[PDB]
Short mmCIF file of C-alpha atoms in Angstrom, two decimals:
data_model
loop_
_atom_site.label_atom_id
_atom_site.label_comp_id
_atom_site.label_asym_id
_atom_site.label_seq_id
_atom_site.Cartn_x
_atom_site.Cartn_y
_atom_site.Cartn_z
CA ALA H 1 71.09 -207.54 85.01
CA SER H 2 71.80 -207.17 88.75
CA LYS H 3 74.51 -209.37 90.29
CA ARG H 4 73.50 -211.27 93.42
CA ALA H 5 75.55 -212.16 96.50
CA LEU H 6 74.82 -214.68 99.24
CA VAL H 7 76.46 -214.15 102.65
CA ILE H 8 76.03 -217.11 105.02
CA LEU H 9 75.81 -216.00 108.64
CA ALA H 10 76.29 -218.49 111.46
CA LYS H 11 76.55 -218.11 115.22
CA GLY H 12 80.09 -217.15 116.06
CA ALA H 13 80.86 -215.38 112.78
CA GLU H 14 83.28 -212.46 112.87
CA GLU H 15 80.87 -209.52 112.66
CA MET H 16 83.38 -207.18 111.05
CA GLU H 17 84.07 -209.76 108.33
CA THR H 18 80.32 -210.01 107.78
CA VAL H 19 79.33 -206.32 107.75
CA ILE H 20 82.18 -204.89 105.71
CA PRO H 21 81.61 -207.03 102.58
CA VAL H 22 77.82 -206.68 102.81
CA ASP H 23 78.07 -202.90 103.08
CA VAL H 24 80.67 -202.54 100.34
CA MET H 25 78.88 -204.88 97.99
CA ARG H 26 75.66 -202.94 98.44
CA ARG H 27 77.53 -199.71 97.71
CA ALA H 28 78.53 -201.36 94.42
CA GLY H 29 74.92 -201.99 93.55
CA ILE H 30 75.05 -205.74 94.22
CA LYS H 31 71.90 -207.36 95.62
CA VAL H 32 73.08 -209.01 98.84
CA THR H 33 71.15 -211.58 100.87
CA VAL H 34 72.40 -212.10 104.40
CA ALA H 35 71.17 -215.63 105.09
CA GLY H 36 71.07 -217.13 108.55
CA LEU H 37 72.35 -220.69 108.73
CA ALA H 38 69.87 -221.71 111.45
CA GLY H 39 66.82 -219.70 110.34
CA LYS H 40 65.57 -216.12 110.25
CA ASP H 41 66.26 -215.42 113.92
CA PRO H 42 68.91 -212.92 115.07
CA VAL H 43 72.53 -214.18 115.06
CA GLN H 44 74.99 -213.55 117.91
CA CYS H 45 78.38 -212.91 116.37
CA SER H 46 81.74 -213.60 117.91
CA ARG H 47 82.05 -210.23 119.67
CA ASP H 48 78.35 -210.29 120.73
CA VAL H 49 77.12 -207.99 117.99
CA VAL H 50 73.66 -209.30 117.08
CA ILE H 51 72.64 -209.09 113.40
CA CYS H 52 69.19 -209.82 111.90
CA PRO H 53 69.52 -211.83 108.67
CA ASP H 54 67.51 -210.95 105.58
CA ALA H 55 66.27 -214.54 105.21
CA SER H 56 66.82 -218.11 106.33
CA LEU H 57 69.34 -220.06 104.27
CA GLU H 58 66.54 -222.50 103.39
CA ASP H 59 64.57 -219.68 101.75
CA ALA H 60 67.58 -217.96 100.21
CA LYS H 61 68.61 -221.32 98.76
CA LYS H 62 65.46 -221.23 96.62
CA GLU H 63 66.15 -217.74 95.20
CA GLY H 64 69.48 -218.49 93.54
CA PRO H 65 71.69 -218.70 91.66
CA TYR H 66 74.19 -216.27 93.12
CA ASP H 67 77.19 -214.79 91.38
CA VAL H 68 79.20 -215.01 94.63
CA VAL H 69 78.81 -217.02 97.83
CA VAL H 70 80.52 -215.37 100.81
CA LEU H 71 81.74 -217.23 103.90
CA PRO H 72 82.76 -214.93 106.77
CA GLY H 73 85.25 -216.07 109.32
CA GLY H 74 85.25 -216.35 113.08
CA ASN H 75 86.45 -219.68 114.47
CA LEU H 76 83.08 -220.89 115.75
CA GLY H 77 81.28 -219.45 112.73
CA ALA H 78 83.54 -221.35 110.35
CA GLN H 79 83.08 -224.52 112.37
CA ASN H 80 79.30 -224.16 112.06
CA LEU H 81 79.71 -223.60 108.31
CA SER H 82 81.97 -226.66 108.06
CA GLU H 83 79.44 -228.94 109.75
CA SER H 84 76.36 -227.90 107.77
CA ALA H 85 75.16 -230.15 104.96
CA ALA H 86 73.23 -227.24 103.45
CA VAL H 87 76.49 -225.33 103.06
CA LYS H 88 78.05 -228.37 101.35
CA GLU H 89 75.23 -228.49 98.81
CA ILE H 90 75.33 -224.74 98.17
CA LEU H 91 79.09 -224.73 97.71
CA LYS H 92 79.20 -227.86 95.51
CA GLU H 93 76.53 -226.33 93.27
CA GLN H 94 78.37 -223.02 93.03
CA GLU H 95 81.57 -224.82 92.10
CA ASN H 96 79.78 -226.84 89.39
CA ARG H 97 78.26 -223.76 87.74
CA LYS H 98 81.61 -221.95 88.00
CA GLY H 99 80.40 -219.21 90.25
CA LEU H 100 82.68 -217.29 92.58
CA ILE H 101 83.31 -218.49 96.14
CA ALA H 102 84.78 -216.04 98.66
CA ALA H 103 85.94 -216.84 102.19
CA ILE H 104 87.93 -214.84 104.73
CA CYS H 105 90.05 -215.55 107.81
CA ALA H 106 88.86 -218.90 109.16
CA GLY H 107 86.13 -219.14 106.52
CA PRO H 108 88.30 -220.97 103.99
CA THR H 109 88.44 -223.98 106.29
CA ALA H 110 84.83 -224.69 105.38
CA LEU H 111 86.08 -225.29 101.86
CA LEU H 112 88.29 -228.12 103.02
CA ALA H 113 85.50 -229.63 105.10
CA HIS H 114 83.30 -229.67 102.00
CA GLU H 115 86.03 -230.73 99.53
CA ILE H 116 85.74 -227.52 97.56
CA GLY H 117 88.36 -226.26 95.14
CA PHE H 118 91.17 -228.74 95.81
CA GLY H 119 94.35 -227.70 94.01
CA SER H 120 93.77 -223.94 94.30
CA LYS H 121 96.08 -221.40 95.88
CA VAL H 122 94.45 -220.03 99.05
CA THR H 123 95.19 -217.89 102.07
CA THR H 124 93.75 -217.94 105.57
CA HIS H 125 94.34 -216.27 108.91
CA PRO H 126 97.86 -217.33 110.05
CA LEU H 127 96.25 -219.17 112.97
CA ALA H 128 94.12 -221.25 110.58
CA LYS H 129 96.95 -222.31 108.24
CA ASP H 130 97.59 -225.73 109.81
CA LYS H 131 93.90 -226.66 109.68
CA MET H 132 93.51 -225.54 106.05
CA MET H 133 96.62 -227.48 104.96
CA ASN H 134 95.77 -230.86 106.55
CA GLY H 135 96.37 -233.27 103.70
CA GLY H 136 98.13 -230.86 101.36
CA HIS H 137 95.02 -230.37 99.21
CA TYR H 138 95.72 -226.65 98.63
CA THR H 139 98.78 -224.48 98.05
CA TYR H 140 99.23 -221.79 100.67
CA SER H 141 99.73 -218.09 100.01
CA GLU H 142 100.58 -215.26 102.38
CA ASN H 143 99.06 -212.60 100.13
CA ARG H 144 96.46 -210.45 101.88
CA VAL H 145 93.95 -211.37 99.15
CA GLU H 146 94.36 -214.46 96.96
CA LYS H 147 92.30 -215.43 93.91
CA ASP H 148 92.84 -218.68 92.03
CA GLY H 149 90.27 -219.59 89.43
CA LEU H 150 86.92 -219.12 91.12
CA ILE H 151 88.25 -219.25 94.71
CA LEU H 152 88.85 -215.93 96.45
CA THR H 153 90.34 -215.91 99.94
CA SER H 154 91.65 -213.41 102.42
CA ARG H 155 93.38 -213.39 105.76
CA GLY H 156 91.62 -211.48 108.54
CA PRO H 157 89.43 -208.67 109.81
CA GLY H 158 92.00 -206.09 108.73
CA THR H 159 91.87 -207.36 105.13
CA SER H 160 88.07 -207.16 104.96
CA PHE H 161 88.00 -204.04 102.81
CA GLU H 162 90.48 -205.40 100.27
CA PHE H 163 88.55 -208.70 100.26
CA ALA H 164 85.23 -206.97 99.57
CA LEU H 165 86.64 -204.73 96.83
CA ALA H 166 88.14 -207.79 95.13
CA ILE H 167 84.63 -209.25 95.02
CA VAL H 168 83.31 -206.02 93.52
CA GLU H 169 86.08 -205.97 90.92
CA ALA H 170 85.35 -209.60 90.04
CA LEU H 171 81.61 -209.05 89.62
CA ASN H 172 81.33 -205.44 88.41
CA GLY H 173 84.77 -204.57 87.10
CA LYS H 174 87.76 -202.44 88.09
CA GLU H 175 86.08 -199.09 87.48
CA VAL H 176 83.13 -199.72 89.78
CA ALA H 177 85.49 -200.96 92.49
CA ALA H 178 87.51 -197.77 92.12
CA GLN H 179 84.39 -195.58 92.31
CA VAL H 180 83.13 -197.38 95.43
CA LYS H 181 86.55 -197.19 97.09
CA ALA H 182 87.12 -193.45 96.91
CA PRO H 183 84.44 -192.30 99.43
CA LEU H 184 85.65 -194.86 101.97
CA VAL H 185 88.87 -193.02 102.80
CA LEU H 186 91.09 -196.06 102.63
CA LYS H 187 94.83 -195.48 102.95
CA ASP H 188 96.00 -197.63 100.03
CA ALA F 1 88.31 -201.62 137.20
CA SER F 2 86.73 -202.26 133.78
CA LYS F 3 86.45 -199.33 131.36
CA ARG F 4 83.02 -198.76 129.84
CA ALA F 5 82.05 -197.54 126.38
CA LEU F 6 78.72 -196.24 125.11
CA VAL F 7 77.99 -196.50 121.37
CA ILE F 8 74.86 -194.61 120.30
CA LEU F 9 73.10 -196.30 117.40
CA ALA F 10 70.51 -194.44 115.34
CA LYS F 11 68.62 -195.32 112.18
CA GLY F 12 70.84 -194.55 109.23
CA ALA F 13 74.16 -195.10 111.03
CA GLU F 14 77.07 -196.42 109.00
CA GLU F 15 77.10 -200.07 110.07
CA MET F 16 80.80 -200.56 109.43
CA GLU F 17 81.60 -197.53 111.60
CA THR F 18 79.42 -199.06 114.31
CA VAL F 19 80.61 -202.69 114.27
CA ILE F 20 84.34 -202.15 113.91
CA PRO F 21 84.79 -200.04 117.09
CA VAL F 22 82.42 -202.23 119.10
CA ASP F 23 84.27 -205.39 118.07
CA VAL F 24 87.73 -203.93 118.60
CA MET F 25 86.85 -202.39 121.93
CA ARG F 26 85.48 -205.70 123.14
CA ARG F 27 88.69 -207.42 122.02
CA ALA F 28 90.47 -204.93 124.30
CA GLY F 29 88.38 -206.00 127.25
CA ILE F 30 86.23 -202.87 127.31
CA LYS F 31 82.60 -203.27 128.38
CA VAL F 32 80.63 -201.86 125.45
CA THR F 33 76.93 -200.97 125.46
CA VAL F 34 75.37 -200.55 122.05
CA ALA F 35 72.44 -198.26 122.88
CA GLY F 36 69.58 -197.65 120.49
CA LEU F 37 68.55 -194.01 120.22
CA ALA F 38 64.85 -194.84 119.75
CA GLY F 39 64.55 -197.85 122.08
CA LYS F 40 65.56 -201.51 122.25
CA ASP F 41 64.16 -202.42 118.84
CA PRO F 42 66.38 -203.46 115.92
CA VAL F 43 68.07 -200.61 113.99
CA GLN F 44 68.26 -200.46 110.19
CA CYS F 45 71.65 -199.07 109.26
CA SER F 46 72.53 -197.10 106.17
CA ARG F 47 73.33 -200.14 104.00
CA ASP F 48 70.31 -202.09 105.40
CA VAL F 49 72.29 -204.17 107.87
CA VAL F 50 69.99 -204.58 110.87
CA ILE F 51 71.63 -204.61 114.32
CA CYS F 52 69.98 -205.41 117.68
CA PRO F 53 71.12 -202.95 120.38
CA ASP F 54 72.12 -204.13 123.83
CA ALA F 55 69.78 -201.61 125.50
CA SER F 56 67.73 -198.50 124.93
CA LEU F 57 69.60 -195.23 125.39
CA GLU F 58 67.14 -194.36 128.19
CA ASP F 59 68.25 -197.44 130.14
CA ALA F 60 71.93 -197.16 129.24
CA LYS F 61 71.80 -193.53 130.37
CA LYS F 62 71.11 -194.76 133.91
CA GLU F 63 74.11 -197.16 133.99
CA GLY F 64 76.85 -194.59 133.44
CA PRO F 65 79.27 -192.99 133.63
CA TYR F 66 81.18 -194.11 130.57
CA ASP F 67 84.86 -193.59 129.87
CA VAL F 68 84.09 -192.99 126.18
CA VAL F 69 80.95 -192.03 124.25
CA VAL F 70 81.07 -193.14 120.61
CA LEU F 71 79.10 -191.50 117.79
CA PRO F 72 79.17 -193.48 114.53
CA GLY F 73 78.68 -191.74 111.25
CA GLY F 74 76.29 -192.17 108.36
CA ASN F 75 74.60 -188.99 107.14
CA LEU F 76 71.10 -189.84 108.37
CA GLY F 77 72.46 -191.41 111.55
CA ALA F 78 74.39 -188.26 112.40
CA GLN F 79 71.33 -186.14 111.67
CA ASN F 80 69.29 -188.24 114.09
CA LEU F 81 72.06 -187.85 116.68
CA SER F 82 72.15 -184.08 116.08
CA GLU F 83 68.41 -183.69 116.66
CA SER F 84 68.15 -185.73 119.87
CA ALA F 85 67.95 -183.89 123.19
CA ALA F 86 69.05 -187.05 125.00
CA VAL F 87 72.29 -187.01 123.02
CA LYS F 88 72.81 -183.35 123.97
CA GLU F 89 72.47 -184.18 127.66
CA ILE F 90 74.75 -187.21 127.43
CA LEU F 91 77.43 -185.30 125.55
CA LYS F 92 77.28 -182.18 127.77
CA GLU F 93 77.65 -184.40 130.85
CA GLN F 94 80.59 -186.28 129.35
CA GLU F 95 82.30 -183.01 128.49
CA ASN F 96 81.79 -181.68 132.04
CA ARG F 97 83.31 -184.75 133.68
CA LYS F 98 86.17 -184.71 131.16
CA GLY F 99 85.41 -188.04 129.64
CA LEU F 100 86.41 -188.98 126.11
CA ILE F 101 84.10 -188.28 123.16
CA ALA F 102 84.74 -190.10 119.87
CA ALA F 103 82.98 -189.48 116.56
CA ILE F 104 83.72 -190.66 113.03
CA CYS F 105 82.88 -189.57 109.48
CA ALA F 106 79.68 -187.53 109.73
CA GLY F 107 79.40 -188.19 113.47
CA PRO F 108 81.39 -185.12 114.48
CA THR F 109 78.64 -182.89 113.13
CA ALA F 110 76.53 -183.89 116.13
CA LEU F 111 79.13 -182.14 118.24
CA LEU F 112 78.46 -178.84 116.53
CA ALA F 113 74.71 -179.29 116.82
CA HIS F 114 75.13 -179.79 120.57
CA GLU F 115 77.82 -177.10 121.06
CA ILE F 116 80.38 -179.64 122.21
CA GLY F 117 84.11 -179.00 122.32
CA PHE F 118 84.29 -175.62 120.56
CA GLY F 119 87.89 -174.63 119.89
CA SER F 120 89.19 -178.17 119.34
CA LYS F 121 90.96 -179.50 116.27
CA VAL F 122 88.71 -182.03 114.52
CA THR F 123 88.43 -184.03 111.33
CA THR F 124 85.41 -185.32 109.45
CA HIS F 125 84.61 -187.05 106.19
CA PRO F 126 85.65 -184.62 103.39
CA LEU F 127 81.98 -184.36 102.39
CA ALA F 128 81.03 -183.21 105.90
CA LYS F 129 83.71 -180.49 106.23
CA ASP F 130 81.50 -177.54 105.24
CA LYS F 131 78.78 -178.53 107.70
CA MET F 132 81.24 -179.03 110.58
CA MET F 133 82.92 -175.66 109.93
CA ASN F 134 79.78 -173.48 109.79
CA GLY F 135 80.67 -170.61 112.09
CA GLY F 136 84.37 -171.39 112.45
CA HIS F 137 83.92 -172.95 115.90
CA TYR F 138 86.53 -175.68 115.27
CA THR F 139 89.88 -175.93 113.51
CA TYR F 140 89.92 -178.47 110.72
CA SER F 141 92.44 -181.27 110.28
CA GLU F 142 92.95 -183.69 107.41
CA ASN F 143 94.64 -186.31 109.60
CA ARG F 144 92.99 -189.72 109.40
CA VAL F 145 92.57 -189.68 113.19
CA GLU F 146 92.63 -186.46 115.22
CA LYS F 147 92.65 -186.09 119.00
CA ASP F 148 92.53 -182.71 120.74
CA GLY F 149 91.99 -182.74 124.46
CA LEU F 150 89.08 -185.08 125.05
CA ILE F 151 87.73 -184.95 121.47
CA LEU F 152 88.70 -187.81 119.16
CA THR F 153 87.57 -187.72 115.54
CA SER F 154 88.16 -189.65 112.36
CA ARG F 155 87.28 -189.41 108.72
CA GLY F 156 85.44 -192.41 107.25
CA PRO F 157 84.66 -196.10 107.06
CA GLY F 158 88.21 -196.85 105.91
CA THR F 159 89.65 -195.19 109.03
CA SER F 160 87.43 -197.18 111.39
CA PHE F 161 90.19 -199.51 112.57
CA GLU F 162 92.61 -196.67 113.32
CA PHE F 163 89.78 -194.80 115.07
CA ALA F 164 88.93 -197.78 117.28
CA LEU F 165 92.55 -198.51 118.18
CA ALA F 166 93.02 -194.87 119.17
CA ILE F 167 90.14 -195.31 121.60
CA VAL F 168 91.77 -198.45 122.98
CA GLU F 169 95.11 -196.68 123.37
CA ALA F 170 93.39 -193.77 125.14
CA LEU F 171 91.53 -196.00 127.60
CA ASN F 172 93.84 -199.01 128.07
CA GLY F 173 97.23 -197.83 126.89
CA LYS F 174 99.59 -198.35 123.95
CA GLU F 175 100.53 -201.94 124.83
CA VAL F 176 96.97 -203.25 124.90
CA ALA F 177 96.25 -201.52 121.59
CA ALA F 178 99.32 -203.18 120.11
CA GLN F 179 98.29 -206.61 121.43
CA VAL F 180 94.75 -206.25 120.06
CA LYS F 181 96.03 -205.04 116.68
CA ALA F 182 98.33 -207.92 115.82
CA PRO F 183 95.69 -210.66 115.24
CA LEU F 184 93.70 -208.34 112.99
CA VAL F 185 96.16 -208.48 110.09
CA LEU F 186 96.17 -204.77 109.44
CA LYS F 187 98.65 -203.48 106.86
CA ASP F 188 100.08 -200.55 108.83
#
């Protein structure tokens, strides 16, 4: 009866956008797997923070399904996500089974690369808007967090807490999100 | 001419309170050393995120002085900081040379353990107030970020961005803090 979350961690990911959702989701009682795109080895994030993943993506792939798949941002991280065929397969499968897909900052651009969720309203970092909108396959929003159908997107490192709590509310409900939020000492 | 920051990372530290200041300080051009209290080996944070430190504290100790020493929170992390004689020596030396000391959430309780900065106004997580105030050696503030003399404190994971930007403003000035803040997409 435990919800499961997959966070895909590639070289160049924004470490804040990785750690905040993992931490908050685990506070909400969600079982989170931090999966390394390239294997089990430690991952050097964009600001040189080095994180050890829980598992390789190859192994985590075999322990699904997940109630949410989480794509952090970081320009080089998102580019690595966008080029990986394993990500394509994971995302296409999640879309087909109507599971939640969550991406933040530059992360949503991996959705375009993999032809995921065309027609949805999405947001990105302002600096990633042009890339996301190439072809007009999505409708753009400037909301700090945007959720359309099963696609949940957010704008940047500074929206990471709101992004993570939206995932919690989607998986575990508004009351759990509220309970997890209070000890964090967020402003609003 | 490069400012230097030491972040002391112990088992049980709050990983969000560790990664956010490191990332933001590096965006501000500060040279940050993430130093592991127990050695160079990977550190399991409070929500099971595993971070690889840049160096052992023993080695980082020899490459000072630092313009700021940063104590993350997390209840067990702060307890490990409070029990370490190496932390005592590092903090006492930083106080004597009038360098900045920054602690967040439960981190400030290590200051009391090590008799650092008595008489200053400080804040903590609400749940750590009673511990910090044992003996009446500090004056308590409920401000989200508090700075009195060379002691900079903050309240919780949700204040981590404001805490980190206050460090930047203290070391590099208000204009650099403002430049680093804009791409983060913070609300206020």
